[PDB]
Design a binder for this molecule. Structure first.
Ligand SMILES: Cc1cc(Br)c([O-])c(-c2nc3cc(C(N)=[NH2+])ccc3[nH]2)c1
Ligand SMILES: [Ca+2]
Ligand SMILES: [Cl-]
Length: 223
């Protein structure tokens, strides 16, 4: 997260860190046994780390659970990143409490101007790499579809939306991929891609979760 602030320990209880010997992507807990992340964060050997604040220190509240299976959307296109969503089933259910809690899926899509909270342990520098130890947060609005398409002509599908600042300086970045974009208490986006990080007129692009709620429910119900 570039231009964001320190969230504060456990203030984002649905945030998870996907780990393979190091943090490589974020994710959101939607119930005690399932996490939603981005398809491009897929790899085998994933350990889901819940209740984290400093990812390099065991401070208490952490729950480390191995992934039992990861389900990448069947129509995921790695070249366009269209359908960039993945579900991860945990080997055992997590213990939910005030520090580890799930976030609700939306019933309707959000409108442009909606203010959302984006969080993650991704890079904090737009020109260079500085990875933080604690969770960073950023409040960012959803942009209109015309501004989004004007910024990325021919690359925005109906399963994506832009959120951020066109002046540059505040944005999600590598390492934040897979994490949550929460607006009014509902998970509306998943950190997916963008051109560089925090560059002027190149806002972040997010997977539009409201388009996948029936797919997530049906897939969870059959697995
Ligand atoms: C080299 C590399 C590898 C991976 Br895997 C990423 O997810 C990314 C990446 N760049 C990103 C840029 C943004 C942004 N909002 N500007 C968001 C997620 C990103 N993820 C970059
Ligand atoms: Ca820790
Ligand atoms: Cl277009």
């Amino acid at each position: 997260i570039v231009g964001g602030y320190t969230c504060g320990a456990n203030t984002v209880p649905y945030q998870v860190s996907l780990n393979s010997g190091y943090h490589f992507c974020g994710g959101s807990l939607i119930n005690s046994q399932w996490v939603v992340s981005a398809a491009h964060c897929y790899k085998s050997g994933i350990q889901v780390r819940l209740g984290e604040d400093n990812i390099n220190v065991v401070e208490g509240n952490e729950q480390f659970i191995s992934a039992s299976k990861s389900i990448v959307h069947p129509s995921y296109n790695s070249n366009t990143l269209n359908n960039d969503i993945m579900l991860i089933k945990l080997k055992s259910a997590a213990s939910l409490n005030s520090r580890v809690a799930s976030i609700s899926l939306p019933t309707s899509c959000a409108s442009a101007g909606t203010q959302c909270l984006i969080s993650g342990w991704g890079n904090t520098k737009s020109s260079g790499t500085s990875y933080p130890d604690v969770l960073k947060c950023l409040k960012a609005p959803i942009l209109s579809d015309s501004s989004c398409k004007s910024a990325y002509p021919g690359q925005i599908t109906s399963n994506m939306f832009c959120a951020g600042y066109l002046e540059g300086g505040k944005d999600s970045c590598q390492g934040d991929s897979g994490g949550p974009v929460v607006c009014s208490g509902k998970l509306q986006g998943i950190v997916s891609w963008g051109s560089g990080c925090a560059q002027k007129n190149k806002p972040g692009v997010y997977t539009k979760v409201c388009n996948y709620v029936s797919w997530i429910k049906q897939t969870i119900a059959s697995n």
